Structure 1
Amino acid sequence: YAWNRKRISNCVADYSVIYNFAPFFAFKCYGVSPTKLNDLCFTNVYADSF
């Protein structure tokens, strides 16, 4: 009910180091593919943890 929201901007994002941080099975994505996140790039990334 009080989920955090962290803004991520002005940095280089390496999405392959996420797998070494938490023990999860699938990097479930909807609009993109989890293996193509290192080539294309965005404006802002928002992280919501609950």
Structure 2
Amino acid sequence: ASVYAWNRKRISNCVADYSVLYNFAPFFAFKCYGVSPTKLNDLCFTNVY
């Protein structure tokens, strides 16, 4: 994107195997001042944006 009219990719009803995203490439920031970005498996998210 170009940052003037930023969109919101709403993730629909599905399953987001976060470990699959962590198996692709190393991450740089990975800084989450919220839910722990390690045990992101056994808790359920209502909607992601």
Q: What TM-score does the superposition give when structure 1 sets the normalisation length?
A: 0.68
Closer, same or farther in 2 for the Cα pair 1:4/1:23, shift >3 Å? farther
Change beyond 3 A, Cα 1:19–1:9: same
Q: 1:40 aligns with which of 19, 29, 43?
A: 43
Size of the aligned set, in residue pairs, is: 46
1:16 deviation in Å?
Answer: 1.1
Determine which structure has the larger strand proportion and give its number.
1
- Aligned-residue CA RMSD (Å): 1.8
Q: Matched residues, percent identical?
A: 98
Structure 1 stretches of 4+ with a deviation exceeding 6 A read: none
SS of aligned partner of 2:36: coil
Question: In structure 2, how many angstroms separate the alpha carbons of the residues matched to 1:32 and 1:26?
Answer: 15
Runs of 5+ in structure 1 lacking a partner?
A: none
Judged with a 3 Å threshold, the aligned counterparts in structure 2 of structure 1 residues 30 and 11 are, in CA distance, closer, same or farther, namely: same
How far does residue 23 in structure 1 lie from its aligned partner after superposition? 4.2
Q: Which has the larger radius of gyration?
A: 2
User: Secondary structure at 2:10's aligned position in 1?
Assistant: strand
